[PDB]
Amino acid sequence: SQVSPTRMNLLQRRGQLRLAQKGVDLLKKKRDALVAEFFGLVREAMEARKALD
Amino acid sequence: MAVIADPETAQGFRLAGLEGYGASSAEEAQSLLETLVERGGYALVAVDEALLPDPERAVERLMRGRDLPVLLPIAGLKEAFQGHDVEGYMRELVRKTIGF
Amino acid sequence: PPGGDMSEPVTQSTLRIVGAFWRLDASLAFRRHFPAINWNGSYSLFTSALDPWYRENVAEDYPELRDAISELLQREAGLQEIVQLVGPDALQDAERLVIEVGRIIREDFLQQNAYHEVDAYCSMKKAYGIMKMILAFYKEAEAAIKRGVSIDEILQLPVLERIGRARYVSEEEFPAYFEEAMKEIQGAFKAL
Amino acid sequence: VARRKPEQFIQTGISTIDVMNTLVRGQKLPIFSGSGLPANEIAAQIARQATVRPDLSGEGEKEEPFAVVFAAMGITQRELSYFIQEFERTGALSRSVLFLNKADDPTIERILTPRMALTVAEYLAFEHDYHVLVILTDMTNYCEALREIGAAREEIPGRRGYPGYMYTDLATIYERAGVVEGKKGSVTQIPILSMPDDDRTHPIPDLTGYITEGQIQLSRELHRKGIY
Amino acid sequence: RMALTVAEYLAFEHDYHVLVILTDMTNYCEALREIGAAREEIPGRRGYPGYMYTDLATIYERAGVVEGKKGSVTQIPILSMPDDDRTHPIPDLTGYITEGQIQLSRELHRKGIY
């Protein structure tokens, strides 16, 4: 069918890992920042709301 | 604008602060809601929890993106209504991020 | 092995032949709480056939403790991650319960020193009571949240401290400290 | 030194070649095509649409014969009749020399017969001053016969069961072509591969890279849309 | 092997302290292979020899302190890999007898942090 090279490509699939394994390390505490501060705005929202409703 | 709720509370959108002439007409006031927002040229579209749009998804699925003039749940009726605390907290955590 | 790989002969042969693999993690090590054994990456297929001979000679409820208690780590592994990111106080009282017990498992039943020889000497009778107390403290934790007992005062009980002083004696003071320590749990959830 | 820069372009009947690569006399265009993608079939399309350009090059090129050569290294029953029936459809059958090989015809002569035929090309192309188009198609079945000597004998497999004398085996074949500086004839050879899958470490895509300058690839992605 | 045998006599028997700094192990290991291939020893994984181990030991094991002899040789070998990947012998081998590894960052060396 269609299949990729197996010694040219050897060099790229080792480098797959360097990009992947390191890549997903930082992916974790990234999104955590935005979602962390988000909470603040949700709580704080109802502050004036309840009062003025 | 275009804000509508119960009759008594609809009165004051008829004045200033807010613009409006409707009230209820359906479950979520579809008769007015859909037809109106199609143009979307109104200064604000706010649908109160006096109608209660259970499928806020109907408008989003149809609009296919627009934060400009789209319902904002408030309350629209008085029973010492300040319950949009305990409601909004659970409405956010359940579908977006980790549950309560 | 050079990577940690299984596609090398030596590993994928041993792997079936010998029935247990004891992986220690680098992170688990660096904080100074020994052993540093990473559980999801360890296993012992031996345990099955030994469960008869364990309870027979050692203690009757000994197997009953091990298997049961391990559920702590499992519901704690996927809990720490990013679900208690917002503090445990903004979560359910059943998902709190996990870190309340969590204290005793991590400061008592996993903390040890290779620098102190009065805690590193361990035997059946010492380890057995430690794992035991954490069963009897979950049984009382969960009765605490069914009565709506605050998580401020349960984390400040004398009960937790009573475990801590009984890992600083090898096995001599252990019997007398189990007389007092057990019954102390009993009257500190009943003192509240 | 006897070779001199190619520049006399022909119509292959696909705008795509005559722009992007702009195939000219004396030049090779290997048609990279994996397995599970036809290339014997679609090659016949080029083979019948081929026609010189004489009004744009400032001189006649129809004045000196445009004969063509074809030659298979190994083909089936259906593709045998399919070829002739696509040469009978335009009458491009006339003025051709066909040194076909089949899969039931000697397996030793899949690699002997190319070498033979190419020295019957040199005679009508260079010494009778004809523009001869050579098209050699089915270059795996080549490699089948090549394999046999590669390893069974004294010769060793220097890459992928084929001899280590591989370099020569792909040199006398491929080298034939190039515009002469003292003849006005030429051998324009267009190899059409059936190289294994989309691999580039396989002997075929290998050496072929370095060799040609101009090259074109066909793929299977647009081939299932049905575009040709 | 030359300066190896001289070194023994430098740091243990003069009480001096030597620091052996080797560089480029790739060449050391290529040349080796040719020698062994004629003694009827088969080359190893990713062509690099398997009789490497023994021979590589003998250079590195004249390192470590010695009882009563204060002076001893400190070993620092330096070797090359395509991107510091562990998918051939050159690191594996080494990495059993020697302790630690100290790899090089692309970010750093670009910015000229040495």
Residue D76, token pair as written in the block: 């089936």
At CA C7, angle to CA C2 and CA C13, rounded to 5? 100
> By the 8 A CB rule, do D164 and D151 touch?
no
For residue D187, list its beta bridge partners.
Answer: D132, D178
- Cβ(C79)–Cβ(C98) under 8 Å? yes
CA distance A2 to D220: 8
Confirm or reject contact between A28 and chain C (CB < 8 A).
Answer: yes
Contact at 8 Å (CB) between D8 and D194?
no
Q: How far apart are CA E46 and CA A11, in angstroms?
A: 14
Q: Do B100 and C83 touch (CB under 8 A)?
A: no
Asked if D203 is an interface residue toward chain A (Cβ–Cβ < 8 A), one would say no
CA distances from A28 to A32, C28, D116, D151 (A): 7, 19, 67, 54
Mention every residue, 6+ apart, whose C-beta is less than 8 A from residue E64.
E72
Instruction: Annotate D211-222 with DSSP letters as a single string.
Output: H-SS-EE--STT
**Number of Cβ pairs < 8 A linking chain A and chain C:** 7
Q: Are C104 and C133 in contact (CB under 8 A)?
A: yes
Which amino acid is located at C17 in the chain? I
CB atoms within 10 A of CB D222: 10
Q: What's the CA gap between A40 and B20, in Å, rounded?
A: 33
3-state secondary structure of D192: strand
CB D42, CB D57: distance < 8 Å:
no
The whole-angstrom separation of Cα C142 and Cα C145 is 5
The one-character DSSP state at C22 is E
Residue ranges in chain C assigned as alpha helix (H): 9-17, 27-30, 47-57, 62-69, 71-83, 93-107, 124-136, 138-145, 158-164, 174-186
Q: Residue D110: in which H helix or E strand, if any? A: helix D109-117
How close B44 gets to chain A, by Cα (Å)?
18
CB B31 within 8 A of CB B25: yes
Tokens 């035997």 locate to C123
- Output the CA torsion sign for D195, D199, D204, D209: positive
Instruction: Give the other-Cβ count within 10 Å of E70's Cβ.
Output: 12
Is residue B40 within 8 A of residue B69, CB to CB? The reply is yes
Angle in degrees, CA D190, D196, D201, rounded to 5:
95
Token pair for C5: 């790989």
Across chain D, the runs of DSSP E, i.e. the strands, are 10-11, 31-32, 51-52, 66-70, 96-98, 131-137, 157-159, 162-163, 178-179, 186-192, 216-217
Q: Is D108 helix (H, G, I), strand (E, B) or coil?
A: coil
Judging contact as 3 or more Cβ pairs under 8 Å, the answer for E and B is: no
Q: Does E45 touch chain C (CB under 8 A)?
A: no
User: What domains are there in chain B, each with its CATH number?
Assistant: 1-100 (3.40.50.10580)
Q: How far apart are CA D203 and CA D166, in angstroms?
A: 9
> 3-class SS at B4?
strand
Give me the long-range contacts of C69-73 (CB less than 8 A, separation at least 24). C69/C105, C69/C131, C69/C134, C69/C135, C70/C39, C72/C98, C72/C101, C72/C102, C72/C105, C72/C134, C73/C39, C73/C105
Q: Which amino acid is at B77?
A: L
Query: In this structure, what token pair is assigned to residue B11?
Result: 């009165």
C35: preceding bond cis by omega (within 30 degrees): yes
Q: Are D162 and D150 in contact (CB under 8 A)?
A: yes
d(CA D197, CA D204): 11
User: CA–CA separation, D148 vs D113, rounded Å?
Assistant: 16
How far is C133 from C103, CA to CA, in rounded Å?
13
Instruction: Put residue B31 in one of left, alpha, beta given phi > 0 → left and psi -120 to 50 → alpha.
Output: alpha
> What percent helix, strand, coil does chain A show, rounded to 5?
80, 0, 20
Please give the angle made by the CA atoms of B63, B67 and B72, to the nearest 5 degrees.
100
**A43 and C CB contact within 8 Å:** no
CB contact under 8 A, B85 and A49: yes
DSSP E64-103: S-BTTB---PEEE-----SSS--SSHHHHTHHHHS-----
Contacts of D222 (CB under 8 A, 6+ apart): none
Q: Which residues of C101-131 are buried (b: 16+ CB within 10 A; e: fewer)?
A: bbebbbebbbebeeeeeebeeeeeebebbbb
From first CA to last CA, the distance across chain C in angstroms is 55
User: Percentage helix, strand, coil, to 5, in chain D?
Assistant: 25, 20, 55
C27 part of contact set with chain B, CB < 8 Å: no
Q: Which residue has the tokens 């364990």?
A: C54
Q: Which residues of A touch E82 (CB under 8 A)?
A: 11, 14
Assigned token pair, D109: 């002569």
Q: Which residues contact D141 (CB under 8 A, 6 or more apart)?
A: D72, D73, D74, D75, D101, D103, D110
**Residue C32, C-beta contacts closer than 8 angstroms, at least 6 positions apart:** C113
Strand ranges inside B1-100, DSSP E: 2-4, 45-47
Resolution in angstroms comes to 9.5
Find out whether C137 and C159 touch, Cβ atoms under 8 Å: yes
Contact with chain A for residue B77, Cβ under 8 A: no
Please give, rounded to a whole number of angstroms, the shortest distance from the CA of E14 to a CA of chain C.
Answer: 38
Best CA proximity match to B97, nearest among C86, C99, C89: C86
Residue with tokens 């990456």: C41
Of B75, B88, B92, the CB nearest to A53: B75
Q: Chain E residues with CB inside 8 Å of A11's CB?
A: 82
Distance between CA atoms of residues D49 and D41, nearest Å: 14
Contact E33, E47 (CB under 8 A): yes
Angle at D155 between CA D151 and CA D157, to 5 degrees: 50
Contacts of A11 in chain D (CB under 8 A): none
Q: b/e for E25-56, b at 16 or more Cβ within 10 A?
A: beebbeebbeebeeeeeebbeeebbebbeeeb
- The full length of chain A comes to 53
Residue among C101, E57, C141, B92 at smallest CA distance from A44: B92
CB D173 within 8 A of CB D114: yes
Distance CA D72, CA D69 (A): 10
Beta-strand relationship, D131-137 and D186-192: parallel
Q: Which residue, B88, B67, B91, is CA-closest to A53?
A: B88
Interface of A with E (CB under 8 A): 11, 14-15, 18
Backbone φ and ψ of D36, nearest 5°: 95, 10
Whether residues B82 and A50 touch (CB distance < 8 A) is answered with yes
Q: What is the CATH number of domain C45-192?
A: 1.10.1140.10
| C71, two tokens | 């559920």
Please answer yes or no on whether C82 and A39 come within 8 Å at the CB atom. Answer: no
CB–CB contact B85 A53 (8 Å) = no
Answer for the pair D186, D175: CB distance below 8 angstroms, yes or no. no
In angstroms, what CA-CA distances link D65 with D68, D87, D96, D179, D185? 9, 18, 11, 15, 9
